[PDB]
Amino acid sequence: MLKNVEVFWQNFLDKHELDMLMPDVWMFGDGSSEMGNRLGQLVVSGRKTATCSSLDIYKMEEEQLPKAGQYDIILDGQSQPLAIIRTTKVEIMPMNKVSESFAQAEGLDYWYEEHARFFKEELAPYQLQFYPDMLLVCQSFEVVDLYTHHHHH
Amino acid sequence: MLKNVEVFWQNFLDKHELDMLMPDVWMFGDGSSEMGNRLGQLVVSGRKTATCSSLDIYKMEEEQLPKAGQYDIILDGQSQPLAIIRTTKVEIMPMNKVSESFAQAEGLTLDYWYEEHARFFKEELAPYQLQFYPDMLLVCQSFEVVDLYTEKEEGGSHHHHHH
Predict the structure, then answer these.
(1) Does residue A40 contact residue A56 with C-beta atoms inside 8 Å?
(2) Overall number of domains in chain B
(3) Do B53 and A150 meet the contact criterion of CB atoms below 8 Å apart?
(4) CB contact under 8 A, B31 and A79
(5) What is the rounded (10 degree) CA torsion for A23, A27, A30, A36?
(6) Which domain CATH number covers B43?
């Protein structure tokens, strides 16, 4: 897998002639392969062009927040490369204040209900100071390329 | 992320003053985050000290089998570096002949242990157009956790959930 992604990135670099360290690699979702595959598909499909993460969870003094212009490599629920996306914007938003504009871009009154359920859990393992107020890092992105082996138990 | 492993291992060679090539890096399971972490914690916690892969894939993939003494960088469910391990034993044995000894090391009755793995390999074999048989040879490794990825406590961007 590490090999696959190394290749995928390299190919993309050469294709656009530009030197860059590999970005972050991840799958959308709770962590389950289902959500990863489903959300992963909507992205490759072009139906899902946004994503949000818990802001509070970020360590303000140890790292910076995702910026416009950065890249990320997307994997499916089975952890296989799906595509690479470029982030075109980053807006901070409270759960109870997401614009239906962003909501449709990444996703409808259930939106909050489902997301509160989503994040109330991610916070759990830490100091899950949950509030409806919760601030989210809402990145708008676009697909700029898309991907086209052993098992140890 | 490519660098995270390059770095983790680099740091490893310094602590012991060794100059080896970076080993294979992989997570346990089929790639599912859940299984990836489940088996990952089992290893770092000292509970799961063995693994097994299908000797068949090595054959069809024309790869050498793991060697006694080799190292493997281990990733967790989020494809983030977890720990590095050293293989102290490599053994080939028919699946229907595994001892409960190996199963306990693996991480709980044999009938179940067997059913579990039968399925796992069933799915891994299929894509190579190969039906899982009852006594397909297994490639078993006995290792020891030789280093934990503690560089993880210095960044913060180590596992965020994106919706």
Answers:
(1) no
(2) 1
(3) yes
(4) yes
(5) 170
(6) 3.10.400.10
- Pick A52's closest partner by Cβ from B1, B141, B163: B163
Q: How was this structure determined?
A: X-ray
State the DSSP H helix or E strand holding residue A2, giving kind and residue range, or none if neither: helix A2-16
- Asked if B82 has any chain A CB less than 8 Å from its own CB, the reply is no
φ/ψ bin of A93: left (φ > 0), alpha (ψ from -120 to 50), beta (otherwise): beta
Whether residue B31 and residue A1 make contact (CB cut-off 8 A), yes or no, is yes
Q: How far is A32 from chain B (nearest CA, A)?
A: 6
What is the extent of the structural domain holding A6? 1-153
Which of A6, A53, A62 lies closest to B160 in CB terms? Answer: A53
Query: What's the Cα-to-Cα distance from A109 to each of A20, A98, A99, A137, B15, rounded to whole Å?
Result: 41, 11, 11, 20, 54
Residue in chain A nearest B74 by alpha carbon: A152
Resolution of the determined structure in angstroms stands at: 3.0
